[PDB]
Design a protein around this ligand. Structure first.
Ligand SMILES: Cc1cn(-c2cc(NC(=O)c3cc4cc(c3C)C#Cc3cnc5ccc(nn35)N(C)CCNC(=O)CCCCO4)cc(C(F)(F)F)c2)cn1
Length: 286
């Protein structure tokens, strides 16, 4: 126990209703009195994996990492208190604001999401990955499904959380047990099965691809085995229609076969941030 986790009395937590069910956890919408709304995670049992995660969740504090408030161990089931993100995960957000579904909102225009919005969303995910790469933390399952959207179009990296139970189609089940998001995985992670920070920047290019594709699954064209091949033979994803050539260069910069030939996430974020606050007339031409 290197760091210490804050604790929240069970009297403070008042469960309203469920937000989703997982194979190992349950997310309820609840209130805390430290009065705001929070998202609590109930363990379905793993107690060692509870404290270990909380210790790691506490150390990770940033503007684009899901805000961890603490735990509650004064009565089973054990709880993990997260902040509430209004628009759910990024993948379900992107899809519901694409040209495919089916009328404005409070945080977003009628849609589809314009270039300025997509660049804004992309920069926030990139900014959060620089922090993780700065701590040399390796997020081995980077995708739009594992990013949350809050009130005000703020994007934070959230889940894992039963993403292998919700989006089971995004994972290849290796052997009898264990799933791999091979469509988001780099060649060295498929072949030699090695994961690094440079293996994450590959995943971000795939994440950056999802954004300008409005939530579609990468290599939706293919099956799991065919997707493995195309990545193995070094076949790249084609530039999505909503993506300008200026941004597709950033994707390919994340898709170099040699992991060290790939650009740093600090450099990728630098390009994405600059394009975000860029004046209208500069983006209209893009
Ligand atoms: C090896 C390792 C990795 N980690 C690690 C863990 C996390 N954890 C995480 O992001 C994490 C984990 C988690 C839940 C949430 C997050 C953010 C959340 C949330 C949240 C806030 N508002 C809403 C509204 C609807 C909604 N969720 N939701 N759903 C749609 C229900 C989801 N349905 C379910 O069934 C999930 C079951 C248990 C889920 O546990 C985050 C990080 C990171 F990336 F942020 F650092 C790292 C710990 N150890």
């Amino acid at each position: 126990s290197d760091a210490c986790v804050h604790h929240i009395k069970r009297r403070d937590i008042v469960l309203k209703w469920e937000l989703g069910e997982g194979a190992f956890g349950k997310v309820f919408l609840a209130e805390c009195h430290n009065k705001m709304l929070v998202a609590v995670k109930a363990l379905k049992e793993a107690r060692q994996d509870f404290q270990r995660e909380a210790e790691l969740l506490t150390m990770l504090q940033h503007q684009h990492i899901v805000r961890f408030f603490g735990v509650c161990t004064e009565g089973r089931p054990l709880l993990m208190v997260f902040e509430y993100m209004r628009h759910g995960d990024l993948n379900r957000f992107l899809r519901s604001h694409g040209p495919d579904a089916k009328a404005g909102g409070e945080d977003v225009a009628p849609g589809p999401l314009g270039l300025g919005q997509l660049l804004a969303v992309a920069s926030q995910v990139a900014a959060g990955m620089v922090y993780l790469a700065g701590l040399h933390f390796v997020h081995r399952d980077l995708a739009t499904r594992n990013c949350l959207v809050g009130q005000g179009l703020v994007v934070k990296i959230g889940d894992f959380g039963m993403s292998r139970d919700i989006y089971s189609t995004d994972y290849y089940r290796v052997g009898g047990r264990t799933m791999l998001p091979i469509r988001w995985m780099p060649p060295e992670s498929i072949l030699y099965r090695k994961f690094t920070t440079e293996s994450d920047v590959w995943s971000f290019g795939v994440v950056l691809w999802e954004i300008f594709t409005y939530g579609k699954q990468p290599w939706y064209q293919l099956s799991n085995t065919e997707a493995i091949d195309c990545i193995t033979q070094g076949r790249e994803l084609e530039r999505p229609r909503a993506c300008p050539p200026e941004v597709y260069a950033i994707m390919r910069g994340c898709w170099q076969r040699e992991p060290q030939q790939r650009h740093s996430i600090k450099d990728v974020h630098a390009r994405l941030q600059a394009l975000a606050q860029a004046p209208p007339v500069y983006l209209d031409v893009l």
